[PDB]
Amino acid sequence: AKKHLKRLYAPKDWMLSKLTGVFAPRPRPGPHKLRECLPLLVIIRNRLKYALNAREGEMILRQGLVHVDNHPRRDGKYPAGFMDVVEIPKTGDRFRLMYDVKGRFALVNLSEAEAQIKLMKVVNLYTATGRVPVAVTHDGHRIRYPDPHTSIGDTIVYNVKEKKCVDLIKNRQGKAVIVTGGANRGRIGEIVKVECHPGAFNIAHLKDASGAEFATRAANIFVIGKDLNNLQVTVPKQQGLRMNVIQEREERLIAAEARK
Amino acid sequence: GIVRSRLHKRKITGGKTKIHRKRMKAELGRLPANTRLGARRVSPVRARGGNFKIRALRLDTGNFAWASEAIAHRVRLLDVVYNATSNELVRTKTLVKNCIVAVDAAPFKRWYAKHYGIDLSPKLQREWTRRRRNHRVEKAIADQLREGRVLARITSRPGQSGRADGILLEGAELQFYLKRLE
Amino acid sequence: MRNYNNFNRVWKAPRRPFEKERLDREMKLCGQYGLRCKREIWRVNMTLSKMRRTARLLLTLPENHPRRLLEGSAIMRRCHEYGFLDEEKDKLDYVLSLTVPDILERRLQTIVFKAGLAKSVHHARVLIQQRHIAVAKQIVTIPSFIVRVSSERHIAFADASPFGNGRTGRVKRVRAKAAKRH
Amino acid sequence: GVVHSTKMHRTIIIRRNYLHFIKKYQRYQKRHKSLAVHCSPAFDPKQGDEVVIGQCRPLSKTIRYNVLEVVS
RNA sequence: GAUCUGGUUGAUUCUGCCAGUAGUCAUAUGCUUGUUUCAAGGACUUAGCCAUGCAUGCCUCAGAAUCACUGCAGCAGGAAUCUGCGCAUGGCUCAUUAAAUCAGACGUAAUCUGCCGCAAAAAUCUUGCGGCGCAAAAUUGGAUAACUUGGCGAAACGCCAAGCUAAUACAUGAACCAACCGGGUGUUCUCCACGUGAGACGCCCAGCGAAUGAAUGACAGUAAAACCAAUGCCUUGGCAGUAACACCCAGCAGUGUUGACUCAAUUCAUUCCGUGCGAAAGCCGGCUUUCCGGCGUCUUUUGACGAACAACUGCCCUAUCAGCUGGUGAUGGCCGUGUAGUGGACUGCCAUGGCGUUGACGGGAGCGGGGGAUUAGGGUUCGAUUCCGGAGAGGGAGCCUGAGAAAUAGCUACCACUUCUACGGAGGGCAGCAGGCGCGCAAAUUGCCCAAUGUCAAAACAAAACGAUGAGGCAGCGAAAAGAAAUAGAGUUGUCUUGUCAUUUCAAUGGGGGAUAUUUAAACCCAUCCAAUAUCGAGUAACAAUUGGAGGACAAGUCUGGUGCCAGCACCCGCGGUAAUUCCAGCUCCAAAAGCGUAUAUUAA
RNA sequence: UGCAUGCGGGCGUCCGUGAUUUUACUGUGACUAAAGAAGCGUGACUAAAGCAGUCAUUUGACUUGAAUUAGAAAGCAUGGGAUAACAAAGGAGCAUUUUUAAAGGUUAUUGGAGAUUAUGGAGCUG
RNA sequence: GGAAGUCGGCAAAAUAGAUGCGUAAGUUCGCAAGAAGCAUUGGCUCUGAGGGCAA
Ligand SMILES: [K+]
Ligand SMILES: [K+]
Ligand SMILES: [K+]
Ligand SMILES: [K+]
Ligand SMILES: [K+]
Ligand SMILES: [K+]
Ligand SMILES: [Mg+2]
Ligand SMILES: [Mg+2]
Ligand SMILES: [Mg+2]
Ligand SMILES: [Mg+2]
Ligand SMILES: [Mg+2]
Ligand SMILES: [Mg+2]
Ligand SMILES: [Mg+2]
Ligand SMILES: [Mg+2]
Ligand SMILES: [Mg+2]
Ligand SMILES: [Mg+2]
Ligand SMILES: [Mg+2]
Ligand SMILES: [Mg+2]
Ligand SMILES: [Mg+2]
Ligand SMILES: [Mg+2]
Ligand SMILES: [Mg+2]
Ligand SMILES: [Mg+2]
Ligand SMILES: [Mg+2]
Ligand SMILES: [Mg+2]
Ligand SMILES: [Mg+2]
Ligand SMILES: [Mg+2]
Ligand SMILES: [Mg+2]
Ligand SMILES: [Mg+2]
Ligand SMILES: [Mg+2]
Ligand SMILES: [Mg+2]
Ligand SMILES: [Mg+2]
Ligand SMILES: [Mg+2]
Ligand SMILES: [Mg+2]
Ligand SMILES: [Mg+2]
Ligand SMILES: [Mg+2]
Ligand SMILES: [Mg+2]
Ligand SMILES: [Mg+2]
Ligand SMILES: [Mg+2]
Ligand SMILES: [Mg+2]
Ligand SMILES: [Mg+2]
Ligand SMILES: [Mg+2]
Ligand SMILES: [Mg+2]
Ligand SMILES: [Mg+2]
Ligand SMILES: [Mg+2]
């Protein structure tokens, strides 16, 4: 039905100026939700600055120069999202879409042999024709023979090459977790306990490295490692630790004065 | 046309709802099938999403099941004999779901003979004996099979799927409708 | 239509239009600081009222309130940076003691006159509007430019000004052209 | 809610009484809402009894809830 | 800035209103505007009526060219046209609308869902040659456009007939290669029996999806023995063990999910028409039954984008609106029908319910929020209008196609209005953008452009080779509103320390004129400059500031003329009847100032 | 692909039985589009704005920034229990445990699986 | 055609049964009222509902 997306109605995380235009690139249906994605045109133009405008972005994208999950994507309206590996082989760029501690999309540079690995959270388990178990992930992947120990909420370590699952991280207490929604999006902590409310939203209580307690809904967490020290993924600069606002302002003022 | 919306209905307070939009295609209804006994006549209906509903105007045969035996056969519909909605549907020989019909009992007699060796290869003789041992047949069903007409309940919706499948009446339900058919 | 460029007012008229005490006080300020109209004073009045309204709200909060700490620090930083308050006074209570002359003394027109670059405040006004005054090598033509303390030492004649290191002005140039023709 | 009427067949009307806060006057009003609830024959509630009701699909023009538990 | 003041009395102290006062992205009107930035802009009244023009189309290497088309000499480009996708978005408006819509918070296990992501696919005796046999890279079929011929018609975003020819249009159709698994059977044959028998071999079926039945879709409060028939073992009579299973698989599911399921999925029986299912019998590239890649499509399935439904709490005034609903559905029940699905949504039958002073029903004004104004605080008030939601396309209805419309720059009918005509007939829908006409107190250009932002799409850009886009942007008009900011500055001497007056001398700068230029899609503004060898310009700086006032409220004249309860002023108190602090003027002064009055609403007071 | 297998209590996971206490209020936490309103930083010459930009001055840094808030009521989790609310009762309208023995009257385990039996647990009374 | 006839609608015409909806001013609240109006009626073949008496 809806084909357009007003720029005011667009997600604020896209960092689109209200005076630049009426419209924003509407994400197509795909791996990620419209509200929880970053379209390729925004990435290639507003973030990587490789394209000065949409015309140059179409030149780059429709040539197949941008690979997402080791696959050329020729649509600038393609929704790229959390944990997606973006590669530009002609310029040697390898990013993974992560959330910084402020809940904004961050392009974390990836080395080789780790751009092959993508973490996917299991959102549903079902049985297909012929009695084959299928695990549906947060990015829309359907895996036809997952680990027998896989449960909803677990993270599957996936190799984008060879299309193979390589490891399973279960969603239990004490596991490293990153928050993918709400006010705590981008923060990283360990699961101290999960409060279960049948028929309603479960609450996960988390403790970051500094010891600060915070909670979210169980659907918003994303297991990323055995412990805070042993993360299976590379995280942004802040390491998921939320700094005090007053302390952050003082540090920025000191740094600005230092450069002056 | 026909609408399934609640706009025209009175509120629980008795108030008259002031409709402030035109009728939508999403809330549409269509005329009933009014399926009757006869040679199979079927009209497709293009439904929402591009899918097709089979509107049965006439049906003659159906796939009827014997639940206790876990088998089914494609038998002919002889007559419709009872309808819980209206006697005027039995009179017009209208086929709807849950109406009681009389179906041919010849296929069920043949299957019973070929499965248990009972009229109503020595390995097959032993197979028959093993099947009979714990098996018991209702007298009411057997009496109907000998007569040639069994009572069955329509379990499909002819106006939706275009087919009249059903199940033979057994036990208390058979006695319930035998009482209401004398 | 579909333009989202915000804008707001920066001044308000006094509630009592004809109050002799207010009229005489504002006449004193206009003559003393060489202001064009009362609107410049009332713009300063709104700036002060917003600062004092913010301070009164913060001083209500407990002294350890995080919002009071953050915004109280910012308010004191702004007052010290623009010279409204001296560095000796660091408490939020001293913001409430700010007066209209405190802000007016920080205007580029007053600063230029006090610095000795102009003979009067009116000479300062025309010098600024005629592109003769530069703050940190940047020509400023706005008399209401509020000078920061850090920028106060960097105020001098513009390098492109006839009084700085630029070409001769209009009357000398026109006189030279007339002499060449003559 | 509390059972209000049991005059229909296998259906009851319950009433949910609550206080609504009027911001201007800093005070409350007593308000009520009536719900038509399907009552299973597993329960025999009487007027004045407190019941727990769960939301189901539309079962009639007005019924959206089912009786789950009765407390005398 | 948590503020008041004038008027009731001969004076006083109250109550109390009237008047004064400040703001409004509140409008309109009057007078006046030199710069510069930023902006609302036919909502109000008539969801009134509209001339004209333009607003939605799309081609790659990669669906179909024999233009009697153009270049080159078969290679390229290719008008038309068929085919595939879109036209259900955007834009406009606010008429309807109070258990509605909407907001926050929930649900769909009650459902549909093209394009997009990740997946799945073993049914289906076909073709050639010969006469059933032998072989296999399936060398399938009939049309129809454009085009030609004849044309009809006044025309018509009107048509007829015949002749050609395409497909990724339509239709048909693929054996073996090619598996695992199961259910019925045979008076089949080999064995063991002396039949709950074991093997083969033969025959019907055994794919996804759909229908109807039948199972599974777990257990999770008791320990010990004996006997009988069948059967596993160790042993040649027992019970030490021990997943299960009469080989060819000695572990090829004894284990789906949820809070919950009649759901997922598996097995058995029967059924599947045309209203399902090709390896499009498809198209391009490289390396040469050559094999590699790209994208294109049928069906199955579930994520995503949505759609539709339901409704937890809330939402103006009115009782000079107290009962409302229930033939012909009102509240509930039963079996159905219908739906994509739930449902009195609807047929039949049944029962009397259901709602209402905690205001139902009815009437009145309203699109709903996010939000605007004003505000010490609490409040009051506005919200047609950019974003979200809803609804409509003159008024109603109905519908086709399609994943999605009850679509309106789609169709059908009626009503009203209206256009062309050759009189036989054919059309129209600006509450899209410009523009008109009316209406009004009241609201711009019949402009330029796809450069940016997006949408669609066969599509990156380029190369003979430029997709559309009144969405949108840019300019014109535009004192709605908002920001900055000119109309002069320094002295000289004299006159009446400062300060007036005359003149008298220095500089400075823009308004404006231009440019090697800059900007811009192109222009235009803004910025830069008045030589860098080399560039115009203030003295009455005539480059001349206005709008209201001068008894009080309320800042500013006991001035001078005129008029004489007249003319007139006056928001209120009042002034004016010959010496007017108030009218008409002059001078002087006051307030705000490129702004200042007036009217009407609204907030404060 | 046995390429396998081994070198008395307290947990946590699910079921089955066993007398039941909420709500208002208040503190934390979640879940909550922008635009708009507060607000951090930032000499777009200032400002109304905007979210930019800044600094080296050989091809690039700042692993640049774009922080934080408030937002009615209702809905969600959890902590506190003073003040209250809802419900119940109306007080004769009401309610001991633990040893032992003896008497009576469709479960595991017996190598599975299909009957039959009897033996006891365990409850039921006395 | 429809009261133009005539003193005058005199005379004639017209309306009609039953059933279901519906029914205004005024009123002494009883009426007005069959107000006014609008619908259906045949034949045939069926289907429901409405009982008595015994065990
Ligand atoms: K081409
Ligand atoms: K509601
Ligand atoms: K089935
Ligand atoms: K039903
Ligand atoms: K464009
Ligand atoms: K006079
Ligand atoms: Mg759920
Ligand atoms: Mg009979
Ligand atoms: Mg008096
Ligand atoms: Mg008086
Ligand atoms: Mg007197
Ligand atoms: Mg200029
Ligand atoms: Mg100009
Ligand atoms: Mg077509
Ligand atoms: Mg449309
Ligand atoms: Mg729209
Ligand atoms: Mg196949
Ligand atoms: Mg399915
Ligand atoms: Mg009643
Ligand atoms: Mg139904
Ligand atoms: Mg405003
Ligand atoms: Mg509005
Ligand atoms: Mg209106
Ligand atoms: Mg408009
Ligand atoms: Mg519409
Ligand atoms: Mg329409
Ligand atoms: Mg139109
Ligand atoms: Mg029309
Ligand atoms: Mg127009
Ligand atoms: Mg106007
Ligand atoms: Mg426009
Ligand atoms: Mg100039
Ligand atoms: Mg411009
Ligand atoms: Mg005065
Ligand atoms: Mg006189
Ligand atoms: Mg101006
Ligand atoms: Mg903002
Ligand atoms: Mg007549
Ligand atoms: Mg007469
Ligand atoms: Mg006569
Ligand atoms: Mg008579
Ligand atoms: Mg009456
Ligand atoms: Mg009468
Ligand atoms: Mg009558």
Curated annotation (Swiss-Prot), chain B:
This protein's record includes keyword Cell cycle: no
The keyword Ribonucleoprotein appears for this protein: yes
Keywords from the UniProt entry: Ribonucleoprotein, Ribosomal protein
Pfam families xref list: Ribosomal_S8e
InterPro entries for this protein: Ribosomal_eS8, Ribosomal_eS8_CS, Ribosomal_protein_eS8_euk, Ribosomal_Se8/biogenesis_NSA2
GO biological process: maturation of SSU-rRNA from tricistronic rRNA transcript (SSU-rRNA, 5.8S rRNA, LSU-rRNA); translation
A Gene Ontology term for the protein's cellular component: nucleolus
GO molecular function, one term: structural constituent of ribosome
Family according to the record: Belongs to the eukaryotic ribosomal protein eS8 family.
Name the record gives this protein: Small ribosomal subunit protein eS8
Native source organism of the sequence: Leishmania major
Gene: RPS8A
